[PDB]
């Protein structure tokens, strides 16, 4: 097989780790446990090619920024995430994340990932965002920023239900091969 490296970044608690957990095996973690930095290796199968996909999980919390630059190195693909129940997280995608990825991963395929799609139509989520004077991120908005940042793909998923999770990694694995 071919060894490829995937790096995943994005706002703290937007769902990066759960994305990895649910994909590589299962069991959706309910309690939030901030990541400092952690590496995983999953063997993905896409288009007949078997790949040893190294997954470099990073920290979304501001208090751990320090270490991130250490995960970026020899990446074959970068996944920038945001949470669809937090419009602000999408703002940061273009107001922070692209810039950072562009600096440490010059010339590496990007995949914008909207997480927690299961919340898009959650009436409670919706009502709460009303107080903040806003609403769940929409597919249009996602695609838009995806295009603005020059992402080579935009996908949505829900680690909670598993929806779209596999597609995210097949896309990432495929992008890692180009």
């Amino acid at each position: 097989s071919i060894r490829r490296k995937l790096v995943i970044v994005g706002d703290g608690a937007c769902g990066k780790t759960c994305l990895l957990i649910v994909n590589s095996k299962g069991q959706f973690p309910e309690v939030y446990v901030p990541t400092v930095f952690e590496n995983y290796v999953a063997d993905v199968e896409v288009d007949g090619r078997r790949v040893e996909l190294a997954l470099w999980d990073t920290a979304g919390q501001e208090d751990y920024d320090r270490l991130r630059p250490l995960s970026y190195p020899d990446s074959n693909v970068v996944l920038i995430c945001f949470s669809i129940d937090l419009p602000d997280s999408l703002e940061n995608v273009q107001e922070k994340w692209i810039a950072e990825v562009l600096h440490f991963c010059q010339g590496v395929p990007i995949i914008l990932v909207g997480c927690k799609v299961d919340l898009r139509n959650d009436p409670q989520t919706i009502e709460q965002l009303r107080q903040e004077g806003q609403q769940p991120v929409t597919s249009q908005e996602g695609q838009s920023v995806a295009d603005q940042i020059g992402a080579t793909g935009y996908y949505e998923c829900s680690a909670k239900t598993g929806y779209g999770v596999r597609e995210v990694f097949e896309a990432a694995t495929r992008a890692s091969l180009m």
Partner: protein, 185 residues
């Protein structure tokens, strides 16, 4: 308060597998947990601030946990642990608080600090706030355990430990005739 939750979670876990049930090896009762802190160790630079380019593969995620012997509450120990899957912890190296001879604050990294026992150990806390809480704990502990004495303190604002130049000078273990060996040649 994600740190607070983390601490509580870690606490509960740590006491459940290392300070709750009597030792499986021998019926010997377990130590009493006092506190802990998560740390980041660099294998290539274990005793000094590592350079900005030290690769992530060199970093090790560990914990420092403090406990007292069941019998004597003045016999505290420092344990270096590793968290394994399933959420359990595995205790490795162990030191006696008595060995703590120096505590230094790193002036560049807000999470860095160096402890001196037999050797010199550089470690970083996960966050600036965590170093401050831990070191406050460690020094207060030592002070409570050793009749008001303190290890050599470097670069810390003494008021952090409710001390001042005067009190510190009187308490430092370096302030004893045979305590500091001379250089040579």
């Amino acid at each position: 308060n994600f740190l607070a939750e983390q601490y509580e979670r870690d606490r509960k876990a740590i006491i459940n597998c290392c300070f709750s049930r009597p030792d499986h090896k021998t019926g010997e009762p377990p130590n009493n947990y006092i506190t802990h802190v998560r740390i980041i160790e660099d294998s290539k630079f274990p005793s000094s601030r590592p350079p900005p380019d030290s690769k992530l593969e060199n970093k090790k995620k560990r914990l420092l946990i403090l406990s007292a012997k069941p019998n004597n509450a003045k016999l505290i120990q420092i344990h270096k642990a590793r968290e394994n899957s399933d959420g359990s912890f595995q205790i490795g190296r162990t030191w006696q608080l008595t060995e703590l001879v120096r505590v230094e604050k790193d002036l560049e990294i807000s999470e860095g600090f160096i402890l001196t026992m037999s050797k010199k150990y550089y470690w970083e806390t996960n966050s600036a706030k965590e170093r401050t809480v831990f070191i406050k704990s460690l020094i207060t502990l030592y002070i409570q355990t050793f009749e008001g004495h303190v290890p050599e303190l470097v670069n810390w604002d003494l008021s952090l430990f409710y001390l001042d130049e005067r009190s510190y000078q009187r308490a430092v273990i370096t302030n004893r005739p045979g305590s500091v060996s001379p250089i040579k040649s």
